[PDB]
């Protein structure tokens, strides 16, 4: 919930425009209140993109612009390029009471017609100072895949193994391919008994499979 | 140029206070048309403005938010802090430092630039817990021609985040730390890994530089084949 309202996601084709609106109400954008736009790149800190309606900072393309009329404002991207895909966030200011920041709840820019990229995949057995300390831990890191959804199973042997799997929701790189980690948690004792383990990764119905031996 | 760094706990007990601090350099809190501002961000959810505060000392808060803020400014050591009282889940988010330059506030026409780093603080009644790096030993299969892929394991922490540095940031190509994974038991892991050139593995030396603020802990591991 924020005050004014964005889509959750927009799309748009390479080279081609795209807008990302923004709504509020009469005691907001209505009121007369400028309407600003920032820009996040994933894990990093918002970055000032439009102010006052339509002015560009230096160091905004000038493929970005910005306008608003009535209760809403739109930002619209020309000539759409694969570096645009960010979350956006529309803010304004509210005089219905004190006298408020107020923000859009952010829109997801996808740019469409990537091509796909298959997964590269490093699997770690687990260190000796690990089992040592009587733990085991391997470790599937998984890199530069598109789009951003991939399935992870680990095999005991050739057996799947289903217990002790943690993985991560997949995470756009600064690349716009995507990241996820898996981690299997064994005791010393089934790392040792087996011949192997592997981290079998799928991926646009293509698997990568790498294994590791005590 | 203007520059604002966050600083403060990453865990607050449910209940208790949550207190942070911004340091600006490169211009100056105190004499200057500006209002000095706090954001938040909760984990993959939109922002959401907290307050701002003028440097005499008056301030603007997020009505939704106001019984509970508090924002203070020190204009000898330019910095100015946030209180956050009687936290919940719900105020588990990074926390950004802003600034706004204002003729007016009720003209309601300024704008958050720049922005700071961010800071997140996790709202938990867990205790902290220290990670434990585990080296994870150069292998050459999953890499481009004449390179190996070595790394850190970082195991078993909370809360929230973890920095990774290679060789003290000596070495920062091919580095890739990937984001975490929240386990069952609740507490975090991640891996850090560095693509470095297969025939100097026995010339050069490799060292993971972890650290974890919210427990105080650092762990330089070298990294050995």
């Known amino acids: 919930q924020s005050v004014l309202t964005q889509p959750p996601s927009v799309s748009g084709a390479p080279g081609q425009r795209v807008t990302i609106s923004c709504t509020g109400s009469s005691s907001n954008i209505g009121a007369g209140y400028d309407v600003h736009w920032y820009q996040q790149l994933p894990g990093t800190a918002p970055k000032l993109l439009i102010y006052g309606n339509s002015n560009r900072p230096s160091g905004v393309p000038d493929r970005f612009s910005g306008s608003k009329s009535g209760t809403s404002a739109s930002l619209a991207i020309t000539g759409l390029q694969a570096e645009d895909e960010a979350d956006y966030y529309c803010?304004?200011?509210?005089?219905?009471?004190?006298?408020?920041?107020?923000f859009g709840g952010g829109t997801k820019l996808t740019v469409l017609g990537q091509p796909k990229g298959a997964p590269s995949v490093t699997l770690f057995p687990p260190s000796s100072e690990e089992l040592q300390a009587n733990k085991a831990t391997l470790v599937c890191l998984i890199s530069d895949f598109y789009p951003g959804a991939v399935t992870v199973a680990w095999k005991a042997d050739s057996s799947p193994v289903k217990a002790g799997v943690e993985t991560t929701t997949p995470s756009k790189q600064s690349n716009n391919k995507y990241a996820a980690s898996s981690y299997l948690s064994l005791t010393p004792e089934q790392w040792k008994s087996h011949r192997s383990y592997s981290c079998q990764v799928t991926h646009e119905g293509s698997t990568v499979e790498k294994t590791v031996a005590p | 140029q203007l520059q604002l760094q966050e600083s403060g706990p990453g865990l607050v007990k449910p209940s208790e206070t949550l207190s942070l601090t911004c340091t600006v350099s490169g211009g100056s809190i105190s004499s200057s048309s500006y209002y000095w501002g706090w954001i938040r961000q909760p984990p993959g959810k939109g922002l959401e403005w907290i307050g701002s505060?003028?440097?005499?000392?008056?301030?603007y808060y997020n009505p939704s938010l106001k019984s509970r803020v508090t924002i203070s400014v020190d204009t000898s050591k330019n910095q100015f802090s946030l209180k956050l009282s009687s936290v919940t889940a719900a105020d588990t988010a990074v926390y950004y430092c802003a600034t706004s330059y204002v003729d007016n506030w009720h003209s309601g026409l300024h704008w958050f630039d720049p922005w700071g780093q961010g800071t997140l603080v996790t709202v938990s009644g867990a205790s902290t817990k220290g990670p434990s790096v585990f080296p994870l030993a150069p292998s050459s299969k999953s890499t481009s021609g004449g390179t190996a892929a070595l790394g850190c394991l970082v195991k078993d922490y909370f809360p929230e985040p973890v920095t990774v540095s290679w060789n003290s940031g000596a070495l920062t190509s091919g580095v890739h730390t990937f984001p975490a994974v929240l386990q069952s038991s609740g507490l975090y892991s991640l891996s850090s890994v560095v693509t470095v050139p297969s025939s100097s593995l026995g010339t050069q030396t490799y060292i993971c530089n972890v650290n974890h603020k919210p427990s105080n802990t650092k762990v330089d591991k070298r990294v050995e084949p």
């Open positions: 505060i003028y440097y005499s000392g008056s301030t």
């Open positions: 803010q304004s200011y509210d005089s219905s009471l004190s006298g408020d920041m107020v």
